[PDB]
From Swiss-Prot:
Pfam family, one: LCM
Source organism of this protein record: Mycobacterium leprae (strain TN)
UniProt xrefs under InterPro entries: Ppm1/Ppm2/Tcmp, SAM-dependent_MTases_sf, SAM_mthyl_Trfase_ML2640-like
Name of the protein described by the UniProt record: Putative S-adenosyl-L-methionine-dependent methyltransferase ML2640
NCBIfam families: mthyl_TIGR00027
Disulphide bonds in the chain: none
Length: 275
């Protein structure tokens, strides 16, 4: 399990522990006790403190956004879901799924094995029809998804959280092309984009974070396609909500964190419907 997947699960666990929790992930603590970096993340001036509060709030708001997306897909009758690079995401376990729902998780086999076994040791299994698809997304993943039972003729809700910023710009295009090729009319996708001008942020976040213990986007590319624009010319109707706009909407934006005035330092949450 990567460092990033642990950190964001730790954030969800931290949110969940509060009385005023925006989201509740009963499985996140379980999942980061059993790696050991959520001891550090569980443990961890104004700018520095504002950075830790931002990490927690951004993850809460992001989680709430994608949860709402899946919940609304369920309401709209969609019964096939795909979580791309599912990591430590516990949505297949914690969200309410109607009978007849299938939820595919695609990620590398060691990540999937860690999550399922860790959850088992705690007596946790899913109620919904959860299907693992062990493959790397930079490789030929569509046949793997199909062999797991995926029906391309059915409406799908796809999720790509915390992924694109860790993929080379050329990989992003190929990913979306494959998704389009597997998507029936009325399918949807929600994705967290890579920030428009956003490698610098991780460094002042790394620096502020490194003072908290005491006590990088290697693929950042100026030529990366804008996601909403790309989807809107490849068979989708796509719109974007900036992460700061979303954080403001629910009263969770702290303007005290460095680069607060730079909306380009933050992801957008793009939602799209297949035409």
């Amino acid at each position: 399990v990567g460092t990033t997947a642990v950190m964001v699960a730790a954030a969800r666990a931290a949110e969940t522990d509060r009385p005023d929790a925006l989201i509740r992930d009963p499985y996140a603590k379980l999942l980061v006790t059993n790696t050991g970096a959520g001891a550090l993340w569980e443990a961890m001036d104004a700018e520095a403190a504002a950075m830790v509060e931002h990490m927690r709030s951004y993850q809460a708001v992001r989680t709430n956004f994608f949860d709402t997306y899946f919940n609304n897909a369920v309401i709209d009758g969609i019964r096939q879901f795909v979580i791309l690079a599912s990591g430590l995401d516990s949505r297949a376990y914690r969200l309410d799924w109607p009978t007849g729902t299938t939820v595919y998780e695609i990620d590398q086999p060691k990540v999937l094995a860690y999550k399922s076994t860790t959850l088992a040791e705690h007596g946790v299994t899913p109620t919904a029809d959860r299907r693992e698809v062990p493959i790397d997304l930079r490789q030929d993943w569509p046949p793997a998804l199909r062999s797991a039972g995926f029906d391309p003729s059915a409406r799908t809700a796809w999720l790509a959280e915390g992924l694109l910023m860790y993929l080379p710009a050329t990989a992003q295009d190929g990913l979306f092309t494959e998704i389009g090729g597997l998507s029936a009319v009325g399918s949807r996708i929600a994705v967290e984009t890579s920030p428009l001008h956003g490698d610098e942020w991780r460094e002042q976040m790394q620096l502020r974070f490194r003072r908290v213990s005491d006590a990088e986007l290697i693929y950042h590319d100026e030529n990366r396609a804008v996601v909403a624009d790309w989807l809107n010319r490849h068979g989708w109707r796509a719109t974007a909500q900036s992460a700061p706009d979303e954080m403001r909407r629910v009263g969770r934006w702290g303007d005290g964190v460095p680069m607060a005035d730079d909306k380009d330092a933050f992801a957008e949450f793009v939602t799209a419907h297949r035409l």
